[PDB]
Structure 1
Amino acid sequence: KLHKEPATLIKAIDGDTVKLMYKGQPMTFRLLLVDTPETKHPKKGVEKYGPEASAFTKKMVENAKKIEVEFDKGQRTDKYGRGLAYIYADGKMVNEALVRQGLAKVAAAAAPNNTHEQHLRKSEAQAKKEKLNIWS
């Protein structure tokens, strides 16, 4: 079963990436299962809803009392050394919150790291039906 663990906010980097202090070590965390419009995108730079997604993630982790990271069942870091996790701000999952607002799409999931895929797909479908942001 997945378990939440405490972390401390260091700095929000992008809509899909945040730097946190995890077990005494600063680390960059990539939000599992979501693709947000980038502002720091390698080949494109700033995409249409990127500053908005970026602002959303920043505000959410910045105003939280408690930040927790929840690793999935597969690998815990990607090839760039970033932690792969579901991040919670005062119990609310940031990954889901972005998708629910139409500020992120659900990424192509890779088992074993796909536990909350269906939950996220449900939020995306609602965001689509509401024509929010990305779906406007």
Structure 2
Amino acid sequence: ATSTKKLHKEPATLIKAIDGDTVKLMYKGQPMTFRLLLVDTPETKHPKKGVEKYGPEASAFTKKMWENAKKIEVEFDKGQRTDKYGRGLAYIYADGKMVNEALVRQGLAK
């Protein structure tokens, strides 16, 4: 049995809110930008492109959904640091539900 090293990280605060681009979290008293959240898997038998960017409302969840809904916190890192732009490595948890943002319709709105 291969023991997977899981880092028990603590939750952060609200400093910056963006649609998976750059969100600074209060870690050890210092803010750090982390953006790693991408999941696409529909409930249909054959998983073909899950939910897409429903809207920028996510940035608002950090206000009410952050204080009332399962807000952002850090758990584990991937080990890449840079995925899209290159700003820290961490997933933004919004109201305990991943906003899920990837691609636009089909090809940048065709």
Q: TM-score band, normalised by the shorter chain? A: 0.3 to 0.5
Q: Which has the larger radius of gyration?
A: 2
Identity of aligned residues (%): 99
**Match for residue 109 of structure 1?**
none
User: When you count helix as a share of all residues, which structure comes out higher?
Assistant: 1
Q: Deviations over 1:40-86 (max 9, x none)?
A: 99999999733334434554224468752122342345474422223
Contact 1:69–1:85 (CA under 8 A) maintained in structure 2: yes
**Match for residue 92 of structure 1?**
97
1:93/1:52 CA distance change after superposition, 3 Å? closer
User: When you count strand as a share of all residues, which structure comes out higher?
Assistant: 1
Aligned residues: 105
TM-score, normalization by structure 1: 0.40
How far, CA to CA, are the matches of 1:26 and 1:56 in structure 2? 19
**Where does structure 2 lack aligned partners over 5 or more consecutive residues?**
1-5
**Structural RMSD (CA):** 9.4
Question: More deviation in 29-38 or 82-91?
Answer: 29-38
**Where does structure 1 lack aligned partners over 5 or more consecutive residues?**
106-136
Are residue 81 (structure 1) and residue 86 (structure 2) matched?
Answer: yes
Question: More deviation in 3-12 or 66-75?
Answer: 66-75
